[PDB]
Amino acid sequence: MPYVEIIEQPKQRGMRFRYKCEGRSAGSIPGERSTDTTKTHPTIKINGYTGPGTVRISLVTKDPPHRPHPHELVGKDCRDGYYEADLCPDRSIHSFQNLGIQCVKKRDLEQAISQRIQTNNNPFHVPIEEQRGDYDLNAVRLCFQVTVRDPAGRPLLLTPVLSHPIFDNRAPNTAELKICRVNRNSGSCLGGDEIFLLCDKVQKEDIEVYFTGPGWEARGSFSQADVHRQVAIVFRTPPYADPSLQAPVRVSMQLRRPSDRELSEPMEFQYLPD
Amino acid sequence: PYVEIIEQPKQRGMRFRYKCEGRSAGSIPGERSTDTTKTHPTIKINGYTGPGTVRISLVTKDPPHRPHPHELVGKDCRDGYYEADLCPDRSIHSFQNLGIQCVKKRDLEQAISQRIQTNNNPFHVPIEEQRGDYDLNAVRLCFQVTVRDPAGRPLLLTPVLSHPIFDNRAPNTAELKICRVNRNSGSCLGGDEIFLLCDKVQKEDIEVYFTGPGWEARGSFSQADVHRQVAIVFRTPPYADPSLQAPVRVSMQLRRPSDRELSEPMEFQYLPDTDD
DNA sequence: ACTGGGCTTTTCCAGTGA
DNA sequence: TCACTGGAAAAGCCCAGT
């Protein structure tokens, strides 16, 4: 058979899943190369075939076995929690720009899973015995199921392909880490400089400030009481890899979730002598 | 006779509990209750001393004082109101287990219907004036005292209303509090940037208020400088004297402009400035 | 057993501004 | 004109401690 390739994966972090109460459509999963000058979207290329067909996109769990996910895909040409539309006969590349993730409430879990089985939404045909186990409601994968045609018009189900995982920004343990503001970004190599850091919502047991620089790994000092309402950290800076120096040296300041080694975008911190 | 509230309830700082949270309803304390001496909402009946009954219900904060969708819960409470006998020997009566159980928005109509169905409307507001927007974060207590006349007949005295009782989860009405500040001194010329961590505020209804002898000045910040309602980044105002010879102590505090409410003050020291 | 406070889960809303 | 977007508010949950 021909095959399906993901030319632009979905963006992993930053987007929050939206409940059904917040509207009909849930925005659009952005392409991972989406600038802001540019607005890219998840795209697939169909190799070895060009012509009519069908493309279905559904949500499966992040980890194998990739059971159907309780959450729903909503937006253009979405029904029963999955996307399904005619493949464009003229084009071999296909953009999906209206895919929103609608999260199911925890008290509607077993019913949502029932609808997956009822609608034959099971791209990897996992037995129902294993649709019993726990679901990570903060992470999904896109599953592209493309049906093409043989030379006589016989449906040809191409192998389903899984995207990178998409994480819910609603959950602070899966959200994007962002440093919004600091009272200063310079200090002495002796350390002890008090820093007030403003950040996106974090969890005080699963957070730390990560100073790095070639071959040196330091860590801001604070306690869980020094995290104010999940969105601010008051910590003391660590010493530089040299209580000496003379030169103004620049290093990296990052938030870190130890549970998954996830880093915020780096902020620059300038260690100064004396 | 007439009814007189001689200790109002405590306004701010007590949390309404949903029926889903178990009960956990609590007890409204007196307006001047302390940890050294606990006080409770207390009324005084003037012109009568004898047998009688009292009903306490919830009414809206604003006129018309319709019955509130919330419920009073606790001992001797039923159908959202309190009712029991008064003391037949004195004219001063306290109530010690009054708790406010809040109804959710989707259960609003069911609650108002129960108020009507139970004849819980002390000001007999017509059902026309009874579908407005309700403030689910503010209630008033309504005391309805029934008294005997010299004949022996129930005499319902006019209902008296308490001051508003607020949910502390509403930020427009909660107590203002400074938790952490990165700087308690700065140049008398102003302009020092300061990070302030506070309890939840509203970025459109908050100020940083510097006070002194006939002196008031405000920190400079925009709404974008308020981070998730719990952090303010502002720059200091200049002091009244741009040529200080010695540090001067002023008080710094949060302030809510819409209701003139202020947080606890905090010591800030303006310093002499050298050369800019 | 019964409250006091933080957080999570779910819902609501205002404006923005290409 | 409008899904969308991000901030905020409301509803529910959970733990600790007495």
Author numbering:
A (entry chain B): 18 to 291
B (entry chain A): 19 to 294
Question: What did the authors write?
Answer:
Among the NF-κB family of dimeric TFs, the p50:RelA heterodimer and the RelA:RelA homodimer are most ubiquitous and well-studied. These dimers bind with high affinity to ∼10-bp sequences (κB sites), with a general consensus of GGGRNNYYCC, defined over 35 years ago.
Sequence-specific binding at the weak κB site (2ΔS) was retained upon mutation of strong site for both dimers, demonstrating that NF-κB has the capacity to bind this weak motif. To further evaluate whether the binding by NF-κB dimers to weak κB sites is specific and authentic, we determined the crystal structure of RelA homodimer in complex with a weak κB site (−5G−4G−3G−2  C−1  T0T+1T+2T+3C+4C) present in the promoter of the Cxcl2 gene (the non-cognate base pairs are underlined and the pseudo-dyad axis separating the two halves of the κB site is marked 0T). The Arg33 and Arg35 engaged to the −4G−3G of one half-site, as predicted. This altered protein–DNA contact likely entails the weaker interaction, which nonetheless is specific. Taken together, these results reflect an enrichment of weak κB motifs in the regulatory regions of NF-κB target genes, which can indeed be recognized specifically by RelA; however, a more elaborate mechanism must underlie an efficient occupancy of these weaker sites. Interestingly, X-ray structural studies revealed that the global nature of protein–DNA interaction is preserved regardless of the difference in binding affinity and despite both the protein and DNA undergoing conformational adjustments in forming the complex. These sites often deviated from the consensus at several bases.
